[PDB]
Amino acid sequence: HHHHHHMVHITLDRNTANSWLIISKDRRQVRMGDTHQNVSDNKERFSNYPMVLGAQRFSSGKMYWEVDVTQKEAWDLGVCRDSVQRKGQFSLSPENGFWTIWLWQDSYEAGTSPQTTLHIQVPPCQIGIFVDYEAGVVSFYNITDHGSLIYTFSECVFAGPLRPFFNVGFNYSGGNAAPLKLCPL
Ligand SMILES: NC(=O)N1CCN(c2ccc(F)cc2)CC1
Fold first, then answer.
1. Which cysteines are joined by disulfide bonds?
2. Residue of 43, 20, 39, 65 whose CA lies nearest to 162
3. What is the distance between the alpha carbons of residues 44 and 83, in angstroms, rounded to a whole number?
4. What is the CATH number of the domain that holds 94?
């Protein structure tokens, strides 16, 4: 891909984070804490899952960013509508305002309804995410494997401003404590 030139500087929005997340001072890294992180509750926070949004909102143009997933066993990444549900149970699907992929139990899947099996030969340590707002496209790239395509959502019906979307996953196993990190340009 030749998408690097639409690079955008993404930062995480503390106010949207699940109350167990720890966001770094520079707002570029997030990880699961061992406990509640001593913040007040609000209507923006994701309640059920270890999710957080980027601060940036996109309503036009082409945007690209990269995320480090090194040594994580579980995570979700992509974009979502600014108006997605925050409280209670929900599935990650375009019908609910999410355009995502994930790792879970040694398999990679795209957040379609129902979910779609991904074919990745080289387990990625960094993922590139490309959004073309006007074209209705969200694409995912394997930076570890020379930028190879992972998945393209096309004919997307965004239906509002988009925000970068992150899930660090639970850490029941003790093997998923590693952070998600926004990689430098
Ligand atoms: N202070 C902590 O408890 N951390 C932070 C660093 N961290 C980690 C990072 C990379 C990796 F590959 C594996 C684990 C574990 C959680």
1. none
2. 65
3. 10
4. 2.60.120.920
Experimentally determined by = X-ray
Q: Which atom of ligand 1 is nearest to the CA of 71?
A: 12
Resolution (angstroms) equals 1.3
Tally the domains of the chain. Answer: 1
Which residue segment(s) compose the domain that 19 sits in? 4-182
Alpha-carbon span 39 to 67, nearest angstrom? 26
Please check whether residue 118 is in contact with residue 85, taking contact to mean a CB–CB distance below 8 angstroms: no
Contact 162, 57 (CB under 8 A): yes
For ligand 1, the distance from its centroid to the CA atom of residue 163, given in whole angstroms, is: 26
Residue 61 is encoded by which pair of tokens? 């143009």
